């Protein structure tokens, strides 16, 4: 079950 | 024993044309169970173990959606990192991400992790407390400040301590037949004569699961590391693993030497002797 | 950061001449990920070869398993051929039953 990666979490 | 769920993501920029090559793999312990490859035709998260196939269309839609979101995040990141490091648009570069949770023998949360690399070097990693960041350089410091302001650690911690472990437990039950089974190493020793005065003893561990294993040589009951070779543990290709350890010995003195095998599947360690 | 691949070539099951088996080439410890791996029978490239999905270790270095069905014999020689940016010449590792 993959993380819900929020769009703001770019480097 | 302990268990883990880990995901590995690699994005490689393709400067001449198009989006990065993106490959995602999911593991429970040493068993791959899902994959995504941007070069593949399906454009779906795909099963790679029988026990995950029972998950319904909603699971596969959800995992496909999230893994695509990962790829787009990495696409943006590659552009940002090129700028941070003052690199041209000509070279190919690499982003790698790994995260996951470990649970103990009681299946309760043991630790979580989330690590990120640019061009094969540490960039930013979540610390053991899941509340702070290790930034390797000033570029990653900028990222750290951004992620602190956005409260990334708190939301990652919720996944790593909660969601990750819950789904790990689920997979361990559904895949019980293979995931909760230990395969003890099948062991033997071979003998190879170099000259009249020198011989190599090789101690073999085959067909074992999980991958964690220890092979050690002793001479007259004392550990020997000199004149030994230990190969990296390697996949057999059927889900099990292989390893060997060898020692060079004076011809005729083979009986002095013993190989010792330690593995989860072995209640007591094995001893082998020529 | 450029790391040269380690190579092991080996069989899935204990090798017996005239009996079907699987030939493996495990490549690890390399960076970047772009790599060319061929399995050879008597110097000639084997065609049906598959490989695992790219993954990596704690130190970020990549690993891949390349594999194909094969029947060893006494006459036939098998090998793995690897090219990578870190290598000036292709690296050829011959298969031996005892390793």
Numbering used by the authors:
A (entry chain C): 1 to 11
B (entry chain A): 1 to 274
C (entry chain B): 1 to 99
Q: What text appears in the publication on this structure?
A:
CD8 T-cells mediate immunity to Toxoplasma gondii infection through recognition of peptide antigens presented by the MHC class I (MHC I) molecules of infected cells. Structural characterizations suggest that these long ligands interact with the MHC I molecule much like canonical peptides: The MHC I alpha chain forms a 10 x 25 angstrom groove in which peptide ligands are anchored by their second (P2) and C-terminal (PΩ) residues. Surprisingly, T. gondii ligands were significantly longer than existing structural models can accommodate, and a series of peptide analogs demonstrated that these longer peptides are not anchored to MHC I via their C-termini. Crystallographic studies reveal an unreported structural re-arrangement of residues in the MHC I binding groove that accommodate C-terminal peptide extensions, and this structural flexibility is discussed in the context of infection by intracellular pathogens.
